Design a protein around this ligand. Structure first.
Ligand SMILES: Cc1cc2nc3c(=O)[nH]c(=O)nc-3n(C[C@H](O)[C@H](O)[C@H](O)COP(=O)(O)OP(=O)(O)OC[C@H]3O[C@@H](n4cnc5c(N)ncnc54)[C@H](O)[C@@H]3O)c2cc1C
Ligand SMILES: Cc1cc2nc3c(=O)[nH]c(=O)nc-3n(C[C@H](O)[C@H](O)[C@H](O)COP(=O)(O)OP(=O)(O)OC[C@H]3O[C@@H](n4cnc5c(N)ncnc54)[C@H](O)[C@@H]3O)c2cc1C
Ligand SMILES: [Xe]
Ligand SMILES: [Xe]
Ligand SMILES: [Xe]
Ligand SMILES: [Xe]
Ligand SMILES: [Xe]
Ligand SMILES: [Xe]
Lengths: 615, 615
């Protein structure tokens, strides 16, 4: 991370200086806001944490609960989700506290032993090279804490307005500004029944399964009935079952159970299959029968419930009627994210993960449009992108409901999907057609940017290239240099740089607000195949050693080389970069690859951004 | 980390529940305390952070400054120091904020260019396999913050009493208790001149170079005059010198300069050699002349000073007159740690690192003696251990003041020393003679426990074996199993376990306080050469799957296997364990190896602890 850009600043650098552009939090919900987020769940808090980085935008997030939760229902944190946490700079903390899932063991009835289970299998939870982070388990409330702190420590000093239940949302397609009117009811005993009204430019319903925002704009969850029902109990118990600290799938004559080891090394979660006139004792009794001959002595039960939901999904995620928007469609004003527009069966294994990816998709778009850096039409891509991949995910898990090798295929694909790295957007306003995909085979257009190790040239530090992509709303341009680029500036990477800084028609010059840092909209990172010791910084374009901030201090983290010390760690090899041609990999603020273009196709680059950005 | 041992606990698990055994902090310094620490510098705060883990001990730390510092003079954090930070569970945070030192480049005058420098060399800062953590640079005040938070979040809820200057310390060798009387003068304007008195059992002077505690007990820094003088400036400047983000040693016709890249990617520290009627401007001017033809445009200077000190050291670190203590010597009551008893020349490169190792050495000893778990004689080893290695360090850096390969030898050894991993205690009350060193060649008796990767059997998680050693005052017993131990319990590791739990004469039974967790004094960790998948937990002694806490929850982190997935990562190979015999590696609470014993030499194990522990 970088700090002290404008002078020494004491204390933890992750606490940002309060921005004057942002009015202090008030007891009463403001009358007018840019964005009103409804619901402090994974989705709501994810969006709020993203918008909190832009103090020029007025964001208000409401939640009907009277305060932060301390113990939540979701606990699975996918690899891709961890990558996003890294973007919010708190993945590190999650890794130290969460319970990693390295293996998953399977238990079935012992063939020779009557009514007793035995271990039948074991698989590595995350296939090699799938992600730089592992799949982990951590109490949902803790993820909330991190987002709540990020929000609080942001320049926005953003915090939620609790004990507020959104009663209704209306859009005045005739209003000149703040067309959305939200009616809220205060739920705390001290204000019980009090009605609040908020004028918003955009409203985001992240209010869960029984979302009022969804029903307010007439959308509806379409799907099937609750396939199964699960008894879920978090327990502090003593057992001799040897795989208790692993993620375990148990099938037995007396029922099926799923074991999820919890953070701390002691707590354990049990998913007991069923199908409320059902108790903990019954669940425990069932788990005991299943675990037999292994003994389960439950000492304490911090939490337990009943997880039962069908897979449903809205046809659209916003208030725009057209199934497929076009340049003449009304613009969206209200969006739905998370369970409010799509719920997945427990067996799907998505948990809260996929839900947060909706918010990460919408986040930067809202900010760009509000800042008038992008045409409002951009907002249409939120629904077309997130609705489609959700439906495709459901279609897949619809058949996962079970050749022997066709199953190992289903099993493998399911892993990539639960890890959250299977999302692949189809060609669109933002996504290219992949005609130059061979330039960087390892960076599939439309999928998340698969990070790989590189070596920073300024100080020889080993780093994950994809970690340059932080949740700061910036587009990234990873320019992998052709073999001779460093030696021949007439073309290649250096020529691209020359174009990006000096050609008035370049997207960098056209769309970067006057007076802002040269990398405030487009974060360019250059990667040369040459050993870091062979890259002379002093001979590189200023665009690659950009001054910034009030003191013109130099950013020395824009230039990289491959890891040439350790065998098989060269990113040019790992990601299939065309060595002779090089490659420009354009990445969205949500870490998704938009394009893989030839370094020399400057016109294509300009044209791309001209299609949705505003000069 | 492990938590929820006695029930679900919300919030950050690193915040410990307040212990009732510890009285709340008071505005006025308590009248009587177990330990009085003088000075909130690296040493003082390190000791306080260690003692804060024992709420049954009354610890008071005073500092004359009126509050925590925000910008300190020291900034180099050695590998070994990082290992200790890992023991205090905040090494992670330091790694994310600090500026890593991967390479060190050397610059000298260009032979063909008049009065201009050119790069002459480059070396990897930390030789391969020296430590699992790198050498890093971070503002001293931040290390203080971490210690201050650890202290605050401990069961002790420990915080410093500021604006107190210790005027005098006296020992009443006739007192029945609290033989040490400390006289303090309040320095804050509101209490200016007020005299405070404290009765303490032990006093630790961590009050720096001009320490009053040292002079109070008649000790004195013996050494040579200030070899050199250095102008030190932390600056926010713009330069085109290409190696500014590296640690750089520059020798030129116009002077010598040392570049230390600071946390944040922008701040930089410059050590300008000299030898106060000297200004920043002069330093800057000198640095510019040195950096020529490279330009240095200083924009801001958060801090600057003049580092000038000779290498001096006390003959003893406590108030006991005998040069070498024996069973009939008076017991120590006052100890000196850090610069108060030993200062190293800037070129030595020790910074504040070695200083904190004194406190980490004394910490657990004081606690054990106060808890009557160890004979007070143990306290003698503090001085004999820390004084000797400090002097030996000085003797070495005395000659480092410069065959060509004899220099590369001096250069290499100097690196291990600056990394803080060269400390090697000679045989003593605590340190063995190494007659069975071949059992575990990679764990040199008397040196720090060189961690290596292993695989936890309960959940297959990759971990650093040495990270089992936390700053919790516990001795560790790393039992590396013989090849057939798992298959033949009659002897080997399993037999050792049988002895440790069932033989009344075992150190574990003899010295673990009645009613405490079976691993509260001796932290046993077993390592089998077999693949983790081959270790059946359910068939292991209870000592290896120990119940603990109020609920008898099982600790599943006592059993390990090697990393057999990745080539050349098997700890039995990496650390030279005798495969046929196995090995017992006994480690002190400060992470230093005390013994390497045969698994079967139970008598030797007992005898060792009987020599200083109290039943
Ligand atoms: C009983 C139960 C048990 C579950 N068990 C599991 C499990 O074991 N494993 C698992 O992976 N998932 C489980 N889930 C699902 C998991 O909780 C969700 O997938 C996850 O919470 C979805 O995140 P989200 O942001 O979309 O919305 P949610 O987490 O559903 O949050 C919506 C938020 O909006 C607020 N809100 C709603 N309406 C309004 C309104 N009108 N005004 C103001 N605020 C409002 C709510 O109070 C809530 O905080 C369970 C769900 C339930 C209901
Ligand atoms: C001007 C200066 C510049 C330096 N520059 C560098 C540098 O560039 N690089 C580097 O590596 N090292 C530098 N050092 C050395 C570095 O600061 C020390 O090595 C490090 O602080 C030693 O840690 P310590 O815990 O032993 O004691 P110290 O950090 O010296 O702290 C002693 C503490 O005790 C307190 N104290 C002292 N006497 C009393 C009393 N009677 N009553 C109450 N409180 C008292 C002090 O106020 C202080 O907080 C510098 C030192 C000085 C003085
Ligand atoms: Xe499930
Ligand atoms: Xe750009
Ligand atoms: Xe386009
Ligand atoms: Xe120095
Ligand atoms: Xe022991
Ligand atoms: Xe001994």
């Amino acid at each position: 991370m970088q700090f002290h850009l404008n002078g020494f600043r004491p204390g933890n650098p992750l606490i940002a200086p309060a921005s004057p552009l942002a009015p202090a939090h008030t007891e009463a919900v403001p009358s007018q806001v840019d964005v009103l987020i409804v619901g402090c769940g994974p989705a709501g808090l994810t969006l709020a944490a993203q918008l909190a980085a832009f103090p020029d935008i007025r964001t208000c997030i409401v939640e009907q609960k009277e305060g932060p939760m301390e113990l939540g229902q979701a606990d699975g944190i996918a690899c891709r989700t961890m990558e996003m946490f890294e973007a919010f700079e708190f993945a590190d903390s999650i890794l130290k506290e969460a319970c990693w899932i390295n293996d998953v063991t399977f238990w079935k009835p012992d063939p020779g032993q009557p009514g007793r289970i035995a271990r039948h299998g074991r698989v590595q939870d995350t296939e090699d090279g799938l992600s730089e982070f592992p799949h982990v388990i951590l109490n949902q409330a803790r993820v909330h804490d991190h987002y709540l702190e990020r929000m609080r420590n942001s320049p926005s000093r953003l915090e939620p307005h609790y004990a507020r239940r959104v009663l209704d949302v209306k859009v005045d397609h005739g209003a000149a500004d703040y067309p959305v009117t939200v009616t809220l009811e205060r739920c705390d005993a001290a204000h019980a029944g009090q009605i609040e009204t908020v004028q918003a430019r955009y409203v985001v319903g992240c209010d869960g399964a029984r979302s009022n925002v969804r029903r307010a704009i007439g959308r509806q969850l379409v799907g099937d009935s609750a396939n199964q029902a699960w008894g879920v109990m978090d327990v502090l118990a003593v057992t001799d079952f040897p795989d208790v600290r692993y993620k375990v799938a148990i099938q037995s004559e007396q029922g099926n159970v799923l074991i999820i080891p919890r953070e701390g090394g002691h707590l354990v979660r049990f998913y007991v299959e069923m199908d409320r006139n059902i108790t903990v004792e019954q669940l425990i009794a069932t788990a005991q029968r299943v675990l037999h001959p292994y003994k389960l002595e439950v000492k304490n039960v911090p939490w337990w419930s009943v997880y039962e939901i069908g897979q449903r999904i809205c046809a659209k995620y916003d208030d725009v009627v057209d199934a497929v928007a076009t340049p003449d469609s009304p613009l969206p004003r209200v969006f739905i994210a998370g369970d409010a527009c799509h719920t997945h069966s427990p067996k799907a294994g998505q948990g809260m993960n996929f839900s947060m990816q909706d918010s990460f998709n919408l986040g930067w778009k809202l900010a760009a449009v509000l800042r008038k850096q992008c045409a409002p039409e951009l907002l249409h891509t939120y629904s077309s992108e997130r609705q489609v991949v959700a439906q495709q995910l459901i279609d897949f898990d619809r058949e996962w409901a079970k050749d022997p090798k066709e199953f190992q295929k289903y099993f493998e694909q399911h892993g990539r999907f639960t890890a959250g790295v299977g999302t692949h957007y189809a060609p669109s306003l933002l996504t290219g057609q992949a005609k130059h995909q061979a330039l960087a085979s390892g960076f599939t257009v439309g999928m998340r940017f698969h990070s790989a190790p590189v070596v920073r040239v300024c100080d020889a530090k080993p780093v994950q290239l994809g970690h340059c992509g932080k949740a700061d709303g910036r587009w990234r341009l990873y320019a992998f240099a052709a073999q001779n680029d460093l030696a021949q500036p007439e073309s290649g990477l250096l020529a691209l740089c020359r174009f990006l800084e000096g050609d008035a028609a370049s997207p960098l010059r056209r769309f970067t607000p006057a007076g802002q840092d040269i990398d405030s909209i487009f974060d360019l990172r250059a990667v040369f195949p040459q050993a870091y010791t062979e890259v002379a910084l002093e001979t590189l374009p200023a665009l690659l050693l950009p001054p910034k901030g009030q003191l013109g201090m130099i950013d020395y983290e824009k230039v990289f080389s491959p890891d040439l010390k350790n065998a098989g760690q060269d990113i040019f090899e790992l990601r299939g970069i065309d060595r002779q041609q090089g490659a420009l990999v354009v990445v969205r603020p949500d870490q998704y690859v938009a394009q893989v273009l030839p370094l020399g196709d400057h016109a294509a680059l300009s044209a791309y951004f001209e299609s949705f950005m505003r000069a």
